[PDB]
């Protein structure tokens, strides 16, 4: 359940994907302004599940945490996908922090 | 239409049992030591249907595997990188999740 | 793992309200006349997650559009044609569902 | 919701998976095996929903009917995908009749 | 065999009837090729089972079968039994199956 | 996640061959009505089982079957499936059975 | 499965079964018998899994190592529970070294 | 019979992939230095179902948390301490594994 397709070379896929990878991610953290980006291999996984956004207090600090839980028929994995430092009074909203 | 967040609430006991161990382990690995007190005070849920694209990417003589999530349009349509790891060109492209 | 059928039951009122109009119209078109009594006596459900592939297919100088369903492996993995229609090469490949008789 | 992807020419994987299934279907529809079968264009739609298998009595006849209901976020369409003549005593099982 | 003995046969509870009756009814229908009218469970006996199902590819005299063997752990009674088979190819993947030979 | 997935296929160990070969050989012999000449197990994949077998006496339309239903624990997928049945008389004791 | 129950005071059965085992362990760890030993709180975790007993050679030394692997539905943790220095010729048997 | 070990064998590639990193990290922490070559030469498996009892124990004015494993009767019934740590009386009793 939740398996990856056989790796292939990208086709149109390049136009959709390449830009995000080049942009802020890698451009931000990892130095700045990457030169050469080609991809070369792509593999897809269909995922249905739920994101749990959590406010967590630990030892006098406060994080927001994004935990992904895949449905059982999509592999059932539970993983943290990101966190950010927050204040107690901050609203718990959708976020992605690199 | 879909993919909105539920109103933030205090977690149930079931929520705490499922989520706390996973969060606790993540904090421990991020900080390099186990936390003493860990309390989930608020939870909000979002249904997500989409696809993860696992990519082998060569950039300026380096090779990364990158995990990019694409939500379906009716689940908000967001496209985001969720993780990367340094890899060798010969490494198989498999499922991964790499933290910091 | 998923994609099995539930045990057959007599339909609820919700089932009858959702399904009856669609079935009635289908029978009418198949037989060329509206039926008088239509009664759903048993229902069994299957969750399906997969992809529809809409295909333009050329064979011996004819062109069909073909709707092929592919269930995910954990929903049974079946690959099946669900309908076809005669088309021309210049027709756009769009969503369709074609009943023949 | 439930929209089709941009048309592309089929990949080698597409041709390997889909061509045999289509070829067999054409053969059965026409009553003879075709000589050339070529998929020239493909467009994909992700679907989640439920198949309802129904026993239906109408005007002294009995059919099994396969009705697909897409979830609202996958377009919400409700459609008959096939039927077969059945006896009242037949078990209601998975089927596809062309 | 410390564990894995059968309980004393009793009349089923309402919970038993609700869980098991639909499943049995559907199985009978598929076995006979016709839906039964009345289906009643009159007696139940229960066994705890811990063990492993082995799916096997087995080649014999130029034929290939996939075979489902259940092995209970020794302290659950230790029985090793074939439940079913299907004819397969050498090239077929060895996957989960359960074959009833319905009508 | 839930348990009761299949392990990766392997060639059988010597322990596997010793335990399983006799049982399979006998089963083939009974199915075909003659002992096979060559029997080799070439590949094996395992699934953990944790649950309960329900042995049932069932009356349906004036016939009587004994039915063996397996119920996996919730954390092993929760499936309830019939594994076998036999024709019985109404007066027969309900005991352990396996009918091919 | 595999979460910890809410902490409670130990039952009389808990005290009778577990106190001697804990007392003996403390005695061996400290090299002298304790006077007073009291269990004040207990939290329980059901675990199903497998112990892997390993003979491991590293840099000209040989250890036996006991690694516990919980089933996926019991949390999937893989942890070393003990080790002992051994010779290459020693049989690999069940052990627990404190 | 109950909770017996399998016959020792050379590890499979799956065994090496799962177990080697965990063992390597443990050795590193025990010795204070990462080993160069780590090789698993033999493996034996024991299937175990039971319960971990996490205990807060006060003994002669000191406070330990203790992890005691109890195997079910049909898995051998053994009761063993698997680890302890020094704790404060106010510490929450949570899952732990202490190597020191």
What are the C-alpha distances in Å from G10 to residues B95, C64, H96? 44, 74, 19
Long-range pairs of H82-91 with CB within 8 A, sequence gap ≥ 24:
H82/G81, H82/G82, H82/G96, H82/H52, H83/G81, H84/G25, H84/G29, H86/H62, H87/H56, H87/H63, H88/H63, H89/H56, H89/H58, H89/H63, H91/B36, H91/H56, H91/H63, H91/H65
What are the C-alpha distances in Å from C60 to residues C64, D40, D68? 11, 13, 32
Measured between beta carbons, which residues in chain H are less than 8 angstroms from residue B37?
92
Q: Which two tokens stand for residue E24?
A: 């049995």
Q: Which residue of C has its CA nearest to A71?
A: C2
- Min distance F3 CA to chain G CA atoms (Å): 5
Q: How was this structure determined?
A: X-ray
In whole angstroms, what is the distance from residue F83 CA to residue F99 CA? 9
In whole angstroms, what is the distance from residue A43 CA to residue B54 CA? 5
Q: Which residue of A has its CA nearest to B29?
A: A80
CATH 3.10.450.10 fits H48-91, yes or no: yes
Reported structure resolution in angstroms = 2.0
How far apart, in Å, do the first and last CA atoms of chain F sit? Answer: 33
Q: Which of E4, E50, E75 sits opposite H1 (nearest CB)?
A: E75
Domain boundaries, chain H: 1-47, 48-91
| DSSP, res D8 | B
In whole angstroms, what is the distance from residue B60 CA to residue C58 CA? 44
Domain F50-91, CATH among 3.40.140.10, 3.10.450.10, 2.60.40.420, 3.10.400.10: 3.10.450.10
| Residue pair H88/H15 in contact by the 8 Å Cβ criterion | no
Q: Which residue of H has its CA nearest to F7?
A: H14
Measured between beta carbons, which residues in chain F are less than 8 angstroms from residue A75?
1
Measured between beta carbons, which residues in chain E are less than 8 angstroms from residue D90?
33-35
- Min distance B10 CA to chain H CA atoms (Å): 21
Q: In what side-by-side order are the strands of the sheet with A61-70?
A: A78-85, A61-70, A40-58, B38-59, B62-71, B79-86
In whole angstroms, what is the distance from residue A47 CA to residue B48 CA? 8
In 3D, which of G69, H21, C54 has the Cα closest to residue D18? Answer: C54
Identify the residue whose tokens are 């839906």: E35
CA E59 to chain CA mean position, Å: 23
| Residue pair D53/D80 in contact by the 8 Å Cβ criterion | no
Identify the residue whose tokens are 């409700």: D78
- Min distance E45 CA to chain H CA atoms (Å): 21
Contact across the interface for H79 and G21, Cβ inside 8 Å: yes
Judged on CB neighbours under 10 Å (0-12, 13-18, 19+), C69 is: buried
Q: Which of F8, F10, F15 sits opposite H6 (nearest CB)?
A: F15
Residue E90, SS3 per DSSP: coil
Domain A47-91, CATH among 3.10.450.10, 1.10.10.10, 3.40.640.10, 3.20.190.10: 3.10.450.10
Q: Which residue of E has its CA nearest to D89?
A: E34
* CATH code of the domain made up of G48-89: 3.10.450.10
In whole angstroms, what is the distance from residue C48 CA to residue D68 CA? 9
* CATH code of the domain made up of B49-91: 3.10.450.10
| HSE of E85, CA atoms in CB hemisphere, 13 A | 23
Q: Which of H92, H95, H96 sits opposite B37 (nearest CB)?
A: H92
Q: Which of G21, G40, G68 sits opposite H56 (nearest CB)?
A: G40
Contact across the interface for B36 and H92, Cβ inside 8 Å: yes
In whole angstroms, what is the distance from residue E100 CA to residue F69 CA? 13
Query: What architecture (CATH level 2) is domain E50-103?
Result: Roll (3.10)
CATH 3.10.450.10 fits C49-101, yes or no: yes
Q: Which residue of D has its CA nearest to B2?
A: D73
Q: Which chains touch G (3 or more CB pairs under 8 A)?
A: B, F, H
Q: Which two tokens stand for residue G12?
A: 């009389």
Angle at E3 between CA H2 and CA H75, to 5 degrees: 25
């Amino acid at each position: 359940c939740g398996g990856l397709t056989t790796s292939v070379r990208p086709s149109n896929e390049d136009k959709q994907l390449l830009t995000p990878v080049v942009k802020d991610y890698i451009a931000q953290q990892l130095g700045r302004e990457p030169s050469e980006v080609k991809i070369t291999e792509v593999s897809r996984q269909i995922v249905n599940g739920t994101n749990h956004f959590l406010k967590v207090e630990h030892d006098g600090n406060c994080w927001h945490v994004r935990v992904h839980e895949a449905l059982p028929c999509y592999g059932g994995k539970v993983e943290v996908h990101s966190h950010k430092v927050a204040s107690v009074g901050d609203p718990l909203t959708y976020f992605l922090e690199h």
